[PDB]
Design a protein around this ligand. Structure first.
Ligand SMILES: Nc1ncnc2c1nc1n2[C@@H]2O[C@@H]([C@@H](O)[C@H]2O)[C@@H](c2ccc(F)c(F)c2)CCN1
Lengths: 625, 311
């Protein structure tokens, strides 16, 4: 349903308060682990020798309760970045004490505020805590969408609120967070608790938190309007944000006292559950993708590796894909043989890389649909797939289908083909080596022969995602370059991210290739206009293909072939993230390289700043020929 | 003997010490550690018996802790609670009990500072939720709500005689002078330099255009509203100035509180006449006896009530 929690800065009896919030319908509680007003002294006598206890006993809850229901809170007097040395020193010791108590307790999370620009010493003290033993605890940085200074009432006569637009200034709180998490070296243990206020900022300001690790959204009671029946509700704009945040699967946190005294505290909660149940449903793509969101996978190499049985099963349960292949064959057969020849002219149809036979059956259903004659050849290099093919050829297909157990590049065909059909494409089109395979095969295609698909194009788009950068950064393996994980593409259902500019075509291949000197190597320069202030982390890749005429397949979001949940986008990371200012152009260079044995990509950002060339000589990543 | 509905135990952390015009002592106290985090209100017609529980005139226990307190005349007690509530506790006819008149949850976080305005019918509260609220004590409602500040409100101090006027200060480094009569009520005042954060406020009881403020680095400042560029200031404490209280004298003395666990007593020139190290923990309040004007009663987190003799 909805994972939601209660924020309290007042808990007189821990046992009673917890039962009340559970009764209201809260999954957890955010509370102080030491009294918020209880300032402790660590240096100066006599306050230093203040007798204990210094807080309430851990025995007041079961270990289970501390582990699952309690989010701890830093004490509001703890200011490690105070301008007063004495305060800085006590706040350091107090921060350690409270953070170590949270760790003692086994708390699943702990809240620390970013309520000012300078949080350097707070970042230092947290970093030192994070490196004091390996633990699973999470840190939630309480950041507002709008700094309190920028939402104050215009009631000071000699200090009025600035009515002049300050594009970058309106995004100051994102900069507070960015610096804090940069200083802490992108710890996976540090995330955002995003505090939403009465009046939302500009859309660009809300767009900065795209790609950020938002773990919780804080909604104060103060921001809920009152409906005619007296219930708490939200502005349509506030509802949009909640809908956007439900997609991120955040935990919603209710803070502040009850201002709808006619109703209870489950009222604020019931609105969220109501909004949760009333969202546009998860479509066939959204429902299939569930579980794979920002989960990094290795791109398939079906040429180098023999695919497992369950990999074929995944890429077969896609009827739209084979309806389009069927349609492209149907349309081709009619263009090649007229109604007068519908029983004398029999077409040489070669399925090149037949898998377990769905493309074969699609070529069958397209011969009877078009009511034309075809002689089928089913070529397949994977001997385990050939088992499924040869059982199909015996039990059903018969003499019409001729199973060939060979690689298309090494096979000597008895007769030339009219139509060669294949699905040798990956998420970046040519990344499964479709150019090379089809070049090695076109000799056994007739001079007027058709290749299905006849054309394909890859696209790239610059993306921002500090979540995916961290996800990649975590892929370090022993016995290899400590940075080889950034020099390889990942198939990923890109979820928590921001597309910084429209996808632009990268590399195109045409089949057959009529070039006298066929060269599958490439160099492309792209210029991506960026109209936001952002951080570039990598490039999403998609493809488009023409099977035949207007019959196409696409994973480019703009032209996405609807229903094709099979292909996820590819991600090309960059080792070091790059700041991009609004109005700047991101310029990327991409190469498709090869030798006799392997094919690979290399890429570099040249504007606004230079990166290193990624994957030089295929050192970190190659596609096996 | 213990009065009815009063507990046999007192909360260790003493927050407020307030003398009524008759001489009876008002005590506010919180439990800031241990199992139960709550507060209490105590009345001592014999001030020399305090802090002892079994020798009080009246006693009550609140749901949450007592951050701040003020007398509402002679039978009223206005309470700044952690619960986000402003509580008004009505005294008994025989003055034996302390009964809840109203408890309103308007502030979204701990209420930290309360001040009753000159008429005694209106009050201003300052909170960690950064808000400032003007209250009508008879209707039990908020008249006006001001988000003037950008950080938690530290001190709200009503003017001696104007109902429209009060000072406020905050961790946002603003000292705001208020006048409910202006369409823009607040006005940023203070010294030339930004300096250290303001922690405590006290109007002069005679010069209505003059006040004093204590900073987080233990400095006390003498400020005139008009000149708006501080005349005199002395480093009175080694730690944050918690509170500032003027003596009832025609020519008054200024009592200076601190987290340095000391009390200092100063003259017009902010020069040190007295200092007491009597406390072993933070000094939280000070009241001068309405009866003996040379007497000053402090409370601390060390659960000590120290009666001083100021010459
Ligand atoms: N040069 C070559 N000679 C002969 N056969 C070759 C080959 N290269 C490939 N194939 C074979 O064709 C398919 C695999 O079975 C593969 O072994 C195909 C495929 C992949 C995943 C699927 F889920 C799917 F349904 C189909 C793509 C891989 N290309």
């Amino acid at each position: 349903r909805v994972s939601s929690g209660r924020d309290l800065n007042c808990v007189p009896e821990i046992a009673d308060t917890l039962g009340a919030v559970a009764k209201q319908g809260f999954d957890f509680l955010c509370m102080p682990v030491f009294h918020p007003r209880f300032k402790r002294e660590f240096i100066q006598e006599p306050a230093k020798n203040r007798p204990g206890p210094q807080t309430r006993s851990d025995l007041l809850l079961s270990g289970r309760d501390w582990n699952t229901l309690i989010v701890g809170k830093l004490s509001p007097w703890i200011r490690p970045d105070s301008k007063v040395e004495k305060i800085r020193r006590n706040s350091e010791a107090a921060m350690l004490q409270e953070l170590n108590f949270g760790a003692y307790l086994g708390l699943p999370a702990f809240l620390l505020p970013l309520n000012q620009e300078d949080n350097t010493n707070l970042a230092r003290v947290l970093t030192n805590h994070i490196h004091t033993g390996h633990h699973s605890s999470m840190f939630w940085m309480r950041v507002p969408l709008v700094a309190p200074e920028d939402l104050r009432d215009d009631i000071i006569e000699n200090a009025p609120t600035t009515h002049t637009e300050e594009y970058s200034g309106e995004e100051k709180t994102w900069m507070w967070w960015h610096n804090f998490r940069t200083l802490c070296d992108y710890s996976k243990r540090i995330a955002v608790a995003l505090e939403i206020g009465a009046d939302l900022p500009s859309n660009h300001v809300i767009d900065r938190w795209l790609g950020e690790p938002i773990k919780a959204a804080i909604l104060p009671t103060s921001i809920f309007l009152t409906n005619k029946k007296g219930f708490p509700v939200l502005s349509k704009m506030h509802q949009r944000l909640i809908f956007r945040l439900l997609k991120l699967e955040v935990q919603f946190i209710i803070t502040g006292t009850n201002h709808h005294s006619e109703k209870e505290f489950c009222s604020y909660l019931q609105y969220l559950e109501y909004l949760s149940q009333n969202r546009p449903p998860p479509n066939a793509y959204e429902l299939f993708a569930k579980g794979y969101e920002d989960y990094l996978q290795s791109p398939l190499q079906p040429l180098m590796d023999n695919l497992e049985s369950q990999t074929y099963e995944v890429f077969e349960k896609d009827p739209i894909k084979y309806s389009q292949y069927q349609q492209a064959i149907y349309k081709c057969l009619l263009d090649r043989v007229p109604e007068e020849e519908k029983d004398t002219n029999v077409q040489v149809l070669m399925v090149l890389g037949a898998g377990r036979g769905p493309l074969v059956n699609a070529s069958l259903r397209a011969a009877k649909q078009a009511d034309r004659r075809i002689k089928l050849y089913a070529v397949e290099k994977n001997p385990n797939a050939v088992v499924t093919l040869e059982n199909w050829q015996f039990e059903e297909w018969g003499s019409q289908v001729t199973v060939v157990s060979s690689d298309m590049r090494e096979w000597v065909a008895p007769e030339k083909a009219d139509i060669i059909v294949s699905e040798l494409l990956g998420s970046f089109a040519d990344n499964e080596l479709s150019p090379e395979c089809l070049d090695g095969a076109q000799h056994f295609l007739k001079d007027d022969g058709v290749s299905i698909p006849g054309e394909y194009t890859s696209f790239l788009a610059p993306i921002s995602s500090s979540k995916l950068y961290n996800e990649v950064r975590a892929c370090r393996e022993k016995d290899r370059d400590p940075e080889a994980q950034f020099e390889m593409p990942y198939v990923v259902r890109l979820h928590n991210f921001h597309q910084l500019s429209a996808p632009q075509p990268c590399f195109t291949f045409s089949h057959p290739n009529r070039d006298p000197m066929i060269d599958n190597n490439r160099y492309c320069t792209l210029e991506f206009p960026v109209e936001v202030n952002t951080v570039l982390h990598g490039f999403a890749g998609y493809f488009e293909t023409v099977l035949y005429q207007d019959i196409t397949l696409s994973i480019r979001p703009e032209t996405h072939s609807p229903g094709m949940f099979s292909w996820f986008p590819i991600l090309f990371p960059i080792k070091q993230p790059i700041t991009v200012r609004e109005g700047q152009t991101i310029c990327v260079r991409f190469w498709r390289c090869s030798n006799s044995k392997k094919v690979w990509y290399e890429w570099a950002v040249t504007a606004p700043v230079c990166s290193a060339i990624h994957n030089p000589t295929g050192r970190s990543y190659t596609i096996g020929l | 003997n213990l009065p009815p509905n009063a507990p046999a135990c007192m909360e260790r952390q003493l927050e407020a010490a307030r003398y009524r015009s008759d001489g009876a002592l008002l005590l506010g106290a919180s439990s800031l550690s241990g199992r139960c985090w709550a507060g209490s209100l105590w009345l001592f017609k014999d001030p020399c018996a305090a802090p002892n529980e079994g020798f009080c005139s009246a006693g009550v226990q609140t749901e949450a802790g007592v951050a701040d307190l003020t007398w509402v005349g002679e039978r009223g007690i206005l309470v700044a609670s952690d619960s986000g509530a402003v509580e008004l506790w009505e005294l008994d006819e025989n003055e034996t009990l302390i009964v809840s008149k109203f408890c309103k949850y308007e502030h979204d976080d701990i209420v930290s500072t309360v001040s009753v305005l000159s008429s005694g019918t209106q009050a201003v509260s300052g909170s960690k939720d950064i808000c400032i609220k003007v209250w009508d004590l008879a209707q039990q409602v908020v008249l006006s709500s001001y988000r003037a500040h950008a950080a938690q409100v530290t001190c709200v101090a009503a003017s001696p005689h104007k109902d429209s006027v009060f000072l406020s200060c905050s961790e946002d480094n603003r000292i705001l002078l208020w006048d409910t009569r202006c369409p823009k009520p607040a006005s940023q005042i203070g010294c030339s330099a930004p300096g250290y954060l303001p922690t405590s406020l006290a109007w002069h009881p005679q010069q209505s255009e003059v006040f004093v403020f204590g900073d987080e680095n233990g400095t006390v400042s003498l400020v005139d509203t008009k000149s708006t560029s501080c005349v005199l200031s002395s480093a009175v404490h080694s730690q944050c100035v918690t509170g500032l209280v003027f003596s009832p004298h025609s020519v008054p003395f200024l009592a200076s509180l601190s987290e340095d666990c000391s009390l200092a007593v100063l003259d017009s020139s902010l020069s040190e006449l007295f200092r007491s190290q009597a406390h072993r923990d933070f000094v939280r309040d000070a009241t001068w006896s309405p009866l003996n004007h040379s007497l000053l009663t402090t409370v601390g987190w060390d659960h000590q009530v120290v009666h001083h003799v100021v010459p």
